[PDB]
């Protein structure tokens, strides 16, 4: 049943992506590593060595959180999320980081540590809420240490 529910999600992603792929202008804005190297030419630096989530690729930051630089290789946009009901783990995207209890500063940059609540897209699950509505964003607590092992693991708070 866990294989069947994972197959239904994976098959649904397959036909949408294969049959309905349409050419669109989509390029990635340049990193903040070369942005700071340009700025420094224009140990004083402060660089975050914890795993982060950002969202929109090419944005300017507020001047409060602008000395901090988050490298490209420490970013994750997808997490492995377990649902205690139906006992299924899937990959769903991370929408935002809600609260990091270790540091309220780390909440603002979106530092992914243990017991950190994130918002995840539960569209592929299709869990039916009250009033016959399909969920789009739930709480999920991170239950691993993503700095030590590369994968980000989480459980849905349902």
């Amino acid at each position: 049943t866990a294989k069947a529910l994972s197959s239904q999600i994976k098959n649904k992603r397959a036909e949408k992506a294969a049959r309905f792929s349409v050419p669109i202008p989509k390029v990635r804005g340049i990193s903040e590593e070369e942005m700071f190297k340009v700025v420094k030419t224009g140990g004083w630096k402060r660089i975050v060595t914890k795993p982060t989530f950002v969202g929109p690729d090419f944005t300017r930051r507020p001047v409060k959180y602008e000395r901090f630089i988050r490298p490209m290789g420490l970013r994750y946009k997808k997490a492995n999320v377990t649902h205690p009901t139906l006992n299924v783990t899937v990959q769903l995207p991370i929408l935002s980081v809600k609260k990091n209890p270790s540091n309220p500063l780390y909440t603002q940059l979106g530092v992914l540590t243990k017991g950190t609540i994130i918002e995840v897209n539960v569209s592929d699950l299709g869990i039916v809420t009250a009033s016959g509505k399909i969920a789009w964003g739930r709480y999920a607590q991170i239950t691993n240490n993503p700095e030590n092992d590369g994968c980000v693991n989480a459980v849905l708070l349902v």
């Binding site: 060595t49 490298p71 490209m72 290789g73 420490l74 700095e147 030590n148 092992d149 590369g150 994968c151």
Partner: protein, 55 residues
Amino acid sequence: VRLLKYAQSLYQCKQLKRAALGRMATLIKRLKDPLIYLDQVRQHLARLPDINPTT
């Protein structure tokens, strides 16, 4: 290797290698079934007569 470049302790580097070597290990262990097929078709291909269509 990107993760290791920004690491900050010997514990962190130890845990990151074990993840990488472990993740490549569980990929090969999943590949068990086709490896037996390719071993058996290798034995039978080498034990096949040589036929040259041109002659």
